Point group: none
């Protein structure tokens, strides 16, 4: 009887300026794994099998990497 | 009887300026693993199988890495 | 009867300026593991299988790494 | 009958300027492990299987690492 | 009958300037482990299986490491 849940129940001269804002938001990620089988053999690389939630407002810079999941970087400068 | 939950129940001359704001927010990540089997063999790399939640407002800089999950960096400068 | 929960119940001339703000916030991460089996063999790399919650307002600097989960860095300068 | 919970119940001329703020905040991380089995063999690397909560307002500096979970650094300068 | 809980119940011309602030705060981390089995063999690396909560307002410095959980540093300068 497995379950994952994210709920927002709401049973029942104002001025808003630049308010009630959502910028770079992750909301409500539900994940279930039941009776799964994984075998990972990794030599020198990247393996991601889980849950990744990234929320960013601002990332700035030349040659930057903002969000990287399962990433191999082998550059030659 | 496994369960993960994140709930926001709300049973029942204002001025907002730049208020009630969400910038770089992760909210409500529910994850269940029941009767799973994992085998990981890792030689010199990166393996991520869990839950990763990253919330950032601002990341600044040349050649920066803001959020990295399962990341191999082998550069030559 | 396993359970993880994060709840915000609320049964029942103001001026806001830059207030009630959320910047770089992780909120409500619920995780359940029941009757799981993990085998990890790691030689010289990185393995992450748990729960990681990172909340940052500001990270600044050239060549910086803000949030890194399961990360192998083998650069040559 | 295992349970982890984080609850905020609230049964029942003001001026806010830059107030009621959340900057770099982790809030409400609930985790349950029941009848799990882990085997870790680690030679010279990093393995993280637990719960990590990091909350930072400001991290500044070139070549800095703000939040690192399961991290192998073998650079050559 | 295992349980971990963190609760904030609240049954029932002001001026705020830069007040009621949360900067670099970890709040409400509940963790339960029941009938788990762990075997760790570690040779020369880092293994973290527990609960880590880090809350920092400011970390400053070139080449600094603010928060490190399960970290192997073997640099050559």
């Amino acid at each position: 009887g497995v379950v994952a849940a994210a709920e927002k129940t709401k049973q029942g001269g104002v001025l808003y300026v630049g308010s009630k804002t959502k910028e770079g938001v992750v909301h409500g990620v539900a994940t279930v794994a039941e009776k799964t089988k994984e075998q990972v053999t990794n030599v020198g690389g990247a393996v991601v099998t889980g849950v990744t939630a990234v929320a960013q407002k601002t990332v700035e810079g030349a040659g930057s990497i903002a969000a990287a999941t399962g990433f191999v970087k082998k550059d030659q400068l």
